[PDB]
A paper describes a structure:
Microrchidia CW-type zinc finger proteins (MORCs) are a family of transcriptional regulators conserved in eukaryotes. We recently showed that human MORC2 is necessary, in conjunction with the human silencing hub (HUSH), for silencing of transgenes integrated at chromatin loci with histone H3 trimethylated at lysine 9 H3K9me3. MORC2 is a 1032-amino acid protein predicted to contain several functional domains including an N-terminal GHKL-type ATPase module with a coiled-coil insertion (CC1). Here we report the biochemical and cellular activities of MORC2 variants, alongside structures of wild-type and neuropathic variant forms of a MORC2 fragment comprising the GHKL-type ATPase module and CW domain.
The effect of T424R on the crystal structure of MORC2 is more subtle. The backbone structures of wild-type and T424R are essentially identical, including in the loop that contains the mutation. The arginine sidechain in the mutant does make an additional salt bridge across the dimer interface, with Glu27 from the other protomer. Moreover, the buried surface area at the dimer interface is actually decreased upon the T424R mutation (2527 Å2 buried per protomer versus 2778 Å2 in wild type). The contribution of the mutant Arg424 sidechain to the dimer interface, and its position just three residues away from a key active site residue Lys427, can be expected to alter the ATP-dependent dimerization dynamics of MORC2. Indeed, we found that the T424R variant forms a mixture of monomers and dimers in the presence of AMPPNP, and shows an elevated rate of ATP hydrolysis. This suggests that T424R dimers may form and dissociate more rapidly than in the wild type. Conversely, T424R (which has increased ATPase activity in vitro) was significantly less efficient at GFP reporter repression than wild-type at both loci.
Numbering used by the authors:
A (entry chain B): 5 to 227, 231 to 320, 324 to 550
B (entry chain A): 4 to 227, 233 to 509, 521 to 550
Write the structure that this text describes.
Amino acid sequence: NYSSLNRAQLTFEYLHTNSTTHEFLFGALAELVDNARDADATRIDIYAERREDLRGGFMLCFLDDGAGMDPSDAASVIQFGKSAKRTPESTQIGQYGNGLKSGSMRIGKDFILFTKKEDTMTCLFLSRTFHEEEGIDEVIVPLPTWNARTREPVTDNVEKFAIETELIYKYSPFRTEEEVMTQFMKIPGDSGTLVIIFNLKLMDNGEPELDIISNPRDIQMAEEGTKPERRSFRAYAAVLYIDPRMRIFIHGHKVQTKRLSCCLYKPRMYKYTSSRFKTRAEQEVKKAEHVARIAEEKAREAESKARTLEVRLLTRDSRVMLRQVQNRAITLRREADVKKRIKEAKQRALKEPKELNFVFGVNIEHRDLDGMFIYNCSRLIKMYEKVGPQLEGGMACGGVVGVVDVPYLVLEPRHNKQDFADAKEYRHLLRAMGEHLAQYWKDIAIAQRGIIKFWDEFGYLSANWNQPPSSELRYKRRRAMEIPTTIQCDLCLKWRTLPFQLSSVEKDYPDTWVCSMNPDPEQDRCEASEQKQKVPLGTF
Amino acid sequence: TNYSSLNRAQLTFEYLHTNSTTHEFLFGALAELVDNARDADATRIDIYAERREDLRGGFMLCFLDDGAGMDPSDAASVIQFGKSAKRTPESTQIGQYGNGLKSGSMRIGKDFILFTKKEDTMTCLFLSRTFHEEEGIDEVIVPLPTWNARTREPVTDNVEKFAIETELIYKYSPFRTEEEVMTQFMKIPGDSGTLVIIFNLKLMDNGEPELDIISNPRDIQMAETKPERRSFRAYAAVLYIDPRMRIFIHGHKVQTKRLSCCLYKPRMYKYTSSRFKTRAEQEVKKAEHVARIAEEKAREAESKARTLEVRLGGDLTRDSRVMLRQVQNRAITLRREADVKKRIKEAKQRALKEPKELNFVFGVNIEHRDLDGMFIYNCSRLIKMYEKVGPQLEGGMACGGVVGVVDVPYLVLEPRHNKQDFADAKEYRHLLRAMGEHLAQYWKDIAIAQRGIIKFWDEFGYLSANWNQPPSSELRYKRRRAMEIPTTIQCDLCLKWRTLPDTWVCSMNPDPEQDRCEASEQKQKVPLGTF
Ligand SMILES: Nc1ncnc2c1ncn2[C@@H]1O[C@H](COP(=O)(O)OP(=O)(O)NP(=O)(O)O)[C@@H](O)[C@H]1O
Ligand SMILES: Nc1ncnc2c1ncn2[C@@H]1O[C@H](COP(=O)(O)OP(=O)(O)NP(=O)(O)O)[C@@H](O)[C@H]1O
Ligand SMILES: [Mg+2]
Ligand SMILES: [Mg+2]
Ligand SMILES: [Zn+2]
Ligand SMILES: [Zn+2]
């Protein structure tokens, strides 16, 4: 019994410490978007709610229709490091048990979260304002739960519930039970979550870091020196995931999420055999083989004992002791059989090709927006990273975008999910990408016809590399014929391609598009199987 | 109200790993522990290996300092994540986030055990992830036993607890008996100091430790390019802009240095920072509001005291008397509170009139022309190195070889979580541009073109055509280079920095004015340039 011993504890100032991991502010917002994706949301709405009485003048709200949280899931939010996602073979992005807390506290002083699942609804309130006003150095978190149908309190301690809710009514943006219930009503389905960050951080000039006024369909950094994804959250959100499904809306307006590899001229894929991937997968199998073997030894020991003890023995004493070893044998056999299945699954996975897929294509719409985009378990970590020939002063590989998805066995992310924890191996990957890039440039052979004429044809008349291509009617169409338009159905979440349509070059597409708007007979119903847009194979 | 029934946020075992992922640069994890020794006023830190083939990686990494140490309550606050007494106004401590020892140690190894002594106590703090894994503990449980430094009796309010704590140490730590633990405490020889031992070190895929102490037995190298990114001896030498604390690796002194003293024709440019000014102005306006409120409170309480005295005038009762002193003393306390705040307001007002300037220093690295660029310190601590700025961002020889140094106060920039970057990238980028413009000016000012840039480098013995190769080692070029760089050296005894016209001490100096440890320390006279 260790109950008397000292525990490590969190103090109030740690919330700030933790938040300093995010220099890139959009990386803090990404943590909340990641959590919605991980909860299987089909949509997330990121929107502002004007509140002149709160610091920065609005609250930033993240509303998803994912799985939500029951009361124990909600309580675990404040167990720093706790993540039910951290399982071997995770394709969830979350693994460190920190993102919501590091991200929210970078963005604002306070947050309040509402979540609904099955028959309960829970509020989690993290108020640094309360802590400062009352001189609290611990981290104290109100966590009231109500019945989702009756709205009655669900609590073991009515005095605690009254203190919890009064703290919410005193310090949060919602000053009555009725105002709180209005927030729970914004989660219209059976389940979902609403995170509201408020008292937003200010710049020196007293204005918020986030500008939602300049473009009321966007969230921008309040300050072109910058790539679009570093100043426009609409741009960043579109490419945050390599395989988007979840729809994203900003201030009610759909984000045109995209697969970068489908937005490029003449995409090509190269398989890179990864010695780390294979080495590490082998070591994982060996660990699981060991674990399974030891569990089998222990089960066989207990099974032997049950056999031998039974023959040796009927008093009630001997009956109870025989059953105790018989049940122990049964328990250990079931555990040994579970470890065996884990090991066998890992053995099967080991035989899959241990390769990374590099995809390259030319960004003819914005040739200055080039370099490598490096994803980790499908989540964007690094963008616009120049490699190989791009590191020289040349036109060689100018305009080429590269994409790769790196599994957790090959690389894990830093604390802020904007870098890689193993710099040596990351640099090795960049070197390999650079070599394959050079091969790509040979394989499309622009030198054959020239580069001065290639770019001229898509409307790049200026000698200013970073100037946009011509806007005229012939050049827009010429670029449009090379990159098929793809679009996601708002109903079924399938991705579809649209045949070129000269009447469609003039416009873009509304907040809604559905499969039955498609003119291709082969993909005009939600029922038509999703066609995988496939990338020709190159060799290095 | 009373909040005792309300939920608290808590730390779980896995968070120790999460926190450690901040340190991609492994030497930055080691630097956290060096910082703590510096902050504790250590005059010496020994970073050394103790061989232990039974522990993962084959050795334990030890950090032994002669700093102030920790009393038992100081030691207990180590595991209060975020707690930092160092977080004070005009704090010149590196520590501010209440995290570094925990993030750094858990990047380097699985487990650590710390021994510390201060006055008549000595405390062990044991963070064993091996224990947590073996017994399936999901909280973070930390033995913290204290003994009397002189008698070696336990100092504990709960002997049952103390027995459990020490039994955990003897079971899981590198030291299996009380005698072995006492041996570690005895490695702190003075009245105070701290020994941090990190063990079960992380391994690479090939089963070798990340830290290579074999290739060079006087160094700690990365087992895998700027010297400071592979040699800890190199990195430690430039970790602080104003080194005093001596650093030893495996018992061998590190030649710490002030980068501005190692360069040809160093020059200083003062840069007026609007950010610095505005933030200082706001820190004052806050202090003046705080002193204002306190004054009005004191003035009301003094008024009440006076009025109650005239009203009670003529009352003999014990009651009226005791009550009159409750009010009088309350007035006295508020007055002293108001006066203290008024003093801090005044001190911030005085500091506001100091110049709000950053000092950029540039000089030419004639010994190693390819090791150039800017070194950016934050309250004396190195954050970024070899950062190219201004004309260095071109493919030219202009400003090639120039090293720049600046110390940036917390008011202007604060560090990221891992102290290897800056929290405000916009402001950092602005600083780099300003440094670039001043670098161009420095280059004009030393007039390397008056003599010819090619001939300048020839004279110091750069025979080779490729920028990367070192200059010639012939004797005439060695002396040509050395003659341009004064020799500065630190006394092993008194810690002062000296100039001259291994072990070294003040009395070895031929300068009769610096030839004794009690002679006053001379300041670097870096000449001033203008933008
Ligand atoms: N929108 C959401 N819907 C459902 N569950 C959520 C949501 N946001 C947070 N959670 C839960 O809160 C837990 C902790 O969140 P978080 O602090 O992001 O750490 P994590 O998501 O587990 N891993 P990481 O984010 O990598 O540190 C998650 O594991 C989820 O169980
Ligand atoms: N070698 C040491 N000597 C004396 N005190 C120490 C030592 N190492 C750690 N401490 C104490 O432990 C506390 C926590 O250290 P640490 O975890 O490094 O946080 P910090 O140094 O306060 N600030 P930061 O390092 O910026 O997170 C310090 O504030 C000191 O009080
Ligand atoms: Mg997460
Ligand atoms: Mg520290
Ligand atoms: Zn559809
Ligand atoms: Zn001396």
